[PDB]
Amino acid sequence: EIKELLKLGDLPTSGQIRLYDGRTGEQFERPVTVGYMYMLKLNHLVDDKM
């Protein structure tokens, strides 16, 4: 169903698209996995520690 819901968009079923390097602009070999992970800021801050 993930794969189907990818086909609903025009995204690839494999989940791996081909990416280009920012500084040079030459495509990474062997495509990479990019999606939307839901990140959280944990309450371990660097100025509560330094």
Partner 1 sequence: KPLVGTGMERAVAVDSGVTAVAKRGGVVQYVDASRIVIKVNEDEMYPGEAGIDIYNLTKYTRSNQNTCINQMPCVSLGEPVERGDVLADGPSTDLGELAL
Partner 2 sequence: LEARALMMSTNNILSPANGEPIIVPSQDVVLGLYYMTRDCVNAKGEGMVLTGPKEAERLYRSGLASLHARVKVRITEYEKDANGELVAKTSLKDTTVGRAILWMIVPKGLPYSIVNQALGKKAISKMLNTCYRILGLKPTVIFADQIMYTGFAYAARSG
Partner 3 sequence: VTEFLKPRLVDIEQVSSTHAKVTLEPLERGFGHTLGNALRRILLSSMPGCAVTEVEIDGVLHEYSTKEGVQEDILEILLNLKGLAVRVQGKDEVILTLNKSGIGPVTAADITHDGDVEIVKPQHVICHLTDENASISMRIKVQRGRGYVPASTRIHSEEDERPIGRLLVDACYSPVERIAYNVEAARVEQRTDLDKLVIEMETNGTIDPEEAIRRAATILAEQLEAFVDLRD
List interacting residues with partner 2 (CB under 8 A): 19, 21, 26, 28-32
- Whole-number minimum distance, CB 40 to partner 1, in Å? 5
Kindly compute the dihedral angle of the four CA atoms of residues 30, 31, 37, 43, in this order, to the nearest 10 degrees.
50
Please say whether the beta carbons of 28 and 36 come within 8 A: no
Taking CB within 5 to 8 Å according to partner kind, which of partner 1, partner 2, partner 3, none is near residue 32?
Answer: partner 2
Q: Two tokens at 37?
A: 């992970």
Q: Two tokens at 14?
A: 């494999």
Residues that bind partner 1 (CB under 8 A): 36, 38, 40, 43
Residues that bind partner 3 (CB under 8 A): 22-26
